[PDB]
Design a protein around this ligand. Structure first.
Ligand SMILES: N[C@@H]1[C@H]2CN(c3nc4c(cc3F)c(=O)c(C(=O)O)cn4-c3ccc(F)cc3F)C[C@@H]12
Ligand SMILES: N[C@@H]1[C@H]2CN(c3nc4c(cc3F)c(=O)c(C(=O)O)cn4-c3ccc(F)cc3F)C[C@@H]12
Ligand SMILES: [Mg+2]
Ligand SMILES: [Mg+2]
Lengths: 191, 485, 472, 197
DNA sequence: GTTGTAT
DNA sequence: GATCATACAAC
DNA sequence: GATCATACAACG
DNA sequence: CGTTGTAT
């Protein structure tokens, strides 16, 4: 456990210094952050609000990527580094849970965060540090449902074929629009 | 750590989450419905306003009140997103035919943002009422709201082709729609034309519907793209600002703009000109002053001596947004699926939805007209046998027995029996019968007429045509955008 | 260049403009009514929620739905200004007895703000319903709203001493009020003891009401300030935190996080040794603030004297009584409430009184009609017009206009046998009711008893255990 | 016939819908409250001699604010920048961009307060402008319609304005020291003596 | 600075 | 949606 | 209340 | 890059 008195603006950090049991929850908005922070067990669980929609790194200039405040906050939290400073042996958390809202917009933020993680934090995903919350709200509502280790249900993100993975991201969240609209016309039942 | 942990494939989860957000944006946010030409937020604002009782007849209500009920009963999103969507359909430059009458600062053409919701008040426009006409006669299906404790309409009646008339846009996922506004009367003429002569070709339709009619006016250059868009749903068009050269009181040329292109900010082009004049990218300009008033747009670009206004004019057309291009991408939701429809396909889609609305209404009117006459038949026989009726009642202990006897004695249904039991004593006067007879007789006529309309498809079309003529007769405008070659 | 210009002195416009904003902020914004202990905003939110139908029994409604109405009908201000007030009425650390039941993120004791109105829904509190009891029986006066298109109550019934129970605050113009919360039961005891022995003293009142009872608990050192406060209406008190080094309860209006941040700053300034650690192990049910060779008692004593672990509360009981702001004492506040409570009961009793008598009058006519249903039908059936039919019935059976109308609007299914005996049963019961309500208005002693009895009912249903332990 | 021609740097505040003319003897500077009213003013103001400068929120009480805080205030800075008069040891009344400074605050009680905060600033740090008879107060018959705001309060052919004139500077200095002074007792005693509930 | 209704 | 200044009294 | 970045397609 | 319009 930490001792405090040390030194992001947001991100309610826990009280432990063991990146083997500690967990970081990436939730969307401060509206969700308050509910999650008011019942997270301030010991091995820290929360970090992602304000607005995360930048699609699969279509953004690397200059804009390094400029995004939101990505800078997430990387600053993990303490892994970036690119050449990628040190997975220095991650401040062994459990990065993505907790987006149940609505479609939350689902979109899940895909964005996944692309960001898969592209510039692959050593994390390759090590199985990334999870996805499985919500079925008050403080005890989120705690006794999704934030309690004794209960709850997690979704360990695991990649099978990197080639298929690299293709999926490029197809869906890539620059080429035509290949995307085709996938919509193919795998989608409306009526 | 955790106990029950599952495993999710990255490629699997990503495709699922994206496919969800994809369809969600397509058929439930971005693109509009081909029938009423409305998107979810626009339809919920209109319907929400209808229930709020803010019709053209009634007074205005605070904007916060309108978005408060729409967001709390129909549209499950941010308050601002609803207010902005409302303010836009109250601006003469944004909507070819406004659907919202506002009171207060609703923004300006110069990109000014409307005042906060705690200042502006709005209500339905006179024409917007046509979008809701006969909404309560079961002409549109309804569905549960997001909260599953309120009922909203999937579509609206829409007694005027709102899609072609107000246009659409546009940004979704994997796709994007872009439809230009049209003149009301012209669009209605197009509808009527396609109804009387099914073998009408695109050219024949363009005879009554020449092309786009933007709210600001301006000019259209090249009609080749116009025919291409109507026949394929896709096409490119050139939009140019209406201008004219004046001579100053000193004796030098004066470039005057009066009608910029659609969705073009005057101030934005004003800043763009100074940025080009002070950059030496365009020389010959003496001054660029905006003399536009609250009664006309006047953007003057005076030229110095020994400098051609025409040379500077075309340069502004080719370097500024004073002359842009409109990318026809007539995409709309039809049969739950997004489709790129042509002009005939959009019209035929409106005429069909128009036929269904009229039939549903005729049925509803018929079903209610007869249901009333049935009761009138009961109340009549009751008023004929008031004594024996009053005797059966008073001699009864329970209403169930009293009703049962009336049904058996006078041969009346359960509904007719209750109607007699609920009769006020004031209905037992002498002049009360002749009144009920006059009403009943009128019901017989209406039921006969409505029975015929549902029996003859020829009448339903004629009813649509006649009703359309009334819409145009009351709301149609004169053409603003001059199409030229 | 103007055509019709006028001259206005600088001093004249300054004095006029300032007095306009002063009185408007004093008697209609910052200060609460000594009656219902509410400010214009809170009173509008309650009545707003009431009209919208977000009662404790009914389901919640989105805040945007509530704020949307309270703004467009009563409170002509901002969304944030209203929604911020509503959120305060739903926080257990804000109000000793909450007036709002909200679902979702409504902030924390760490200073965390509430969520957007698009995520949180709410409704009236159970005890909050007491504030609106018999609001539909002409118990309170109504006025037109800012738009002049709606009507709102100038004050709620308030079946419990809201002012002394929840408190009041605060900042106005040229003046500022500050009233601490009290126990619901303790306050109700004071109101009754006052109704019993008007010759009571300040010391006597403090026998049933020791002092404040803040929703955070903690402790109040000293009692001399509590006496001067209840007597003069002004005074000071010291609030200490409950510790055991772990802090369990912080004083009123004190942020645990802020105290934590200030403790870290004081630790990195050599202004206090021993500070090995200072964590915050507070849960969703328990709050724990954890703070060799340091004695602790010397460091802890310094933390309370330097930080915010021990704050001072300044009594300044200011409220609006009779349109004017006055520095009231405890007795003055109780009298102002007891009188308001008497006005409502009387008003309510008169309302039931007038309604029952009116019902009996129309009931008398119906019986007269049912007894002569044969001729009544004969008169109506031979009637030329409804106007003539009413005139004849009034002349024949000697009935009033209302009674005659009540007969003409009689459904045939009411002309049965068992119907007559049913009306007599209802009628005979009303005579006892009207006779009962008459005695209540004729005897002031009963109105006082009705208030007491209905108060003990509130104390029995909503009163809690004392949270703040007083010390010396 | 003097005027402008755009293209100029100006370096004026981000807001401030400055007019077209450049003659500080006909032009008017409207200090409105918030962009809600500013937009209604900016649109329909005769963009030739009437400039709209939106003030956001309540202006700092100079009587209770340190000079280090006054020089840091952005709203006040945007006001002195619009006039182009100068500050303190640079205040030149003979260099003001506007000879007509029209205070146009909301018709609500709060508008009367912001109106009070302005007059103190205009009397404490822009005295020469007031003594020259430039500061006027609009007399509206507010977030009104475009044609409404002009036809009622902005059109000089029908509008009714009031010229702020100073009688006794002694009584003036005392009024500000009492109403907006750091003293609360004298202010509370004033409100208690000059208020009819 | 901090408290809470306001711009 | 989060964040930014400010009046107003009183510690 | 004013502002601030971003997804998304298409034309610039 | 910027802009369009519903969304976070
Ligand atoms: N670092 C980035 C923050 C978020 N940004 C904006 N956010 C807006 C808005 C505008 C923004 F610039 C909105 O306009 C809005 C709304 O509901 O209208 C919600 N939000 C909004 C704010 C926070 C959030 F988590 C989600 C949202 F949709 C920009 C800077
Ligand atoms: N230079 C200062 C501007 C104004 N600031 C704030 N304004 C807020 C608010 C908060 C502010 F920091 C609000 O919170 C608010 C509301 O209605 O809740 C309205 N407003 C508000 C904004 C603009 C305006 F004209 C009037 C207002 F009341 C900060 C900078
Ligand atoms: Mg927004
Ligand atoms: Mg605010």
């Amino acid at each position: 456990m930490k001792s405090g008195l040390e030194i992001p603006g947001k991100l309610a950090d826990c009280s432990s210094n063991n990146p083997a049991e500690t967990e970081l929850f990436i939730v969307e908005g401060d509206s969700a952050g308050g509910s999650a922070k008011s019942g997270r067990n301030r010991e091995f669980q820290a929360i970090l609000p992602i304000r607005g929609k995360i930048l699609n790194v699969e279509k953004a200039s690397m200059d804009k990527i390094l400029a995004n405040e939101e990505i800078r906050s997430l990387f600053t939290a993990m303490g892994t580094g970036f690119g050449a400073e990628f040190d997975v042996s220095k991650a401040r958390y062994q459990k990065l849970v993505l907790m987006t809202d149940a609505d479609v917009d939350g689902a979109h933020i899940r895909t964005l965060l996944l692309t960001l993680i898969y592209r510039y934090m692959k050593p994390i995903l390759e090590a199985g540090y990334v999870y996805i919350a499985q919500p079925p709200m008050d403080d005890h509502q989120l705690w006794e449902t999704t934030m309690d280790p004794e209960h709850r249900l997690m979704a360990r993100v695991s990649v099978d074929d990197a080639a298929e993975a690299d293709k999926i991201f490029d197809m869906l969240m890539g620059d080429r629009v035509e290949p995307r609209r085709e996938f919509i016309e193919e795998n989608a039942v409306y009526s | 750590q955790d106990k029950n942990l599952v495993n999710v494939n990255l490629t699997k989860e990503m495709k699922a989450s994206f496919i969800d957000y994809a369809m969600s944006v397509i058929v439930a946010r971005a693109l509009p419905d081909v029938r009423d030409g409305l998107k979810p937020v626009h339809r919920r604002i209109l319907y929400g306003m209808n229930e709020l009782g803010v019709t053209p007849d009634k007074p205005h209500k605070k904007s916060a009140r309108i978005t408060g009920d729409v967001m709390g009963k129909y549209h499950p999103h941010g308050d601002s997103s609803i207010y902005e969507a409302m303010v836009r359909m109250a601006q003469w430059w944004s909507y070819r035919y406004m659907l919202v009458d506002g009171h207060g600062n609703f923004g300006s053409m110069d990109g000014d943002s409307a005042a906060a919701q705690r200042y502006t008040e709005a209500r339905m426009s006179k024409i917007a009422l046509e979008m809701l006409r006969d909404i309560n006669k079961n002409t549109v299906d309804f569905v549960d709201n997001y909260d599953a404790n309120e009922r909203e309409p999937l579509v609206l009646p829409a007694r005027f082709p709102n899609l072609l008339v107000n246009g659409a846009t546009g940004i979704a996922v994997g796709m994007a729609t872009n439809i230009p506004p049209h003149n009301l009367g012209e669009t209605i003429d197009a509808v009527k034309l396609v109804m009387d002569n099914p073998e009408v070709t695109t050219k024949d339709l363009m005879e009554v519907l020449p092309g786009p009619d933007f709210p600001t006016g301006a000019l259209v250059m090249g009609k080749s793209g116009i025919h291409k868009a109507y026949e394929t749903g896709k096409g490119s068009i050139v939009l140019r600002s209406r201008t004219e050269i004046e001579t100053t009181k000193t004796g030098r040329e004066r470039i005057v703009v009066t009608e910029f292109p659609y969705m073009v900010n005057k101030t934005k082009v004003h800043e763009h000109i100074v940025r080009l004049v002070q950059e030496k990218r365009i020389e010959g300009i003496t001054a660029v002053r905006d003399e536009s008033n609250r009664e006309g747009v006047r953007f003057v670009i005076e030229v110095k001596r020994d400098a051609s206004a025409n040379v500077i004019l075309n340069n502004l057309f080719k370097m500024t947004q004073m002359q842009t291009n409109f990318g026809f991408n007539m995409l709309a939701i039809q049969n739950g699926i997004p489709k790129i429809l042509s002009l005939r396909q959009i019209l035929d889609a409106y005429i069909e939805h128009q036929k269904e609305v009229v039939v549903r209404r005729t049925r509803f009117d018929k079903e209610k007209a007869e249901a009333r006459a049935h009761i009138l038949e009961g109340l009549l026989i009751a008023l004929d046998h008031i004594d024996e009726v009053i005797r059966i009642i008073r001699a009864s202990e329970t209403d169930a027995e009293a009703q049962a006897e009336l049904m058996s004695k006078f041969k009346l249904s359960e509904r007719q029996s209750q109607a007699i039991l609920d009769m006020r004593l004031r209905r037992l006067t002498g002049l009360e019968r002749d009144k009920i007879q006059s009403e009943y007789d009128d019901l017989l006529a209406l039921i006969a007429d409505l029975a015929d309309i549902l029996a003859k498809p020829e009448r339903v079309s004629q009813i649509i045509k006649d009703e359309l003529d009334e819409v145009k007769r009351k709301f149609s405008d004169k053409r603003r955008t001059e199409l030229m070659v």
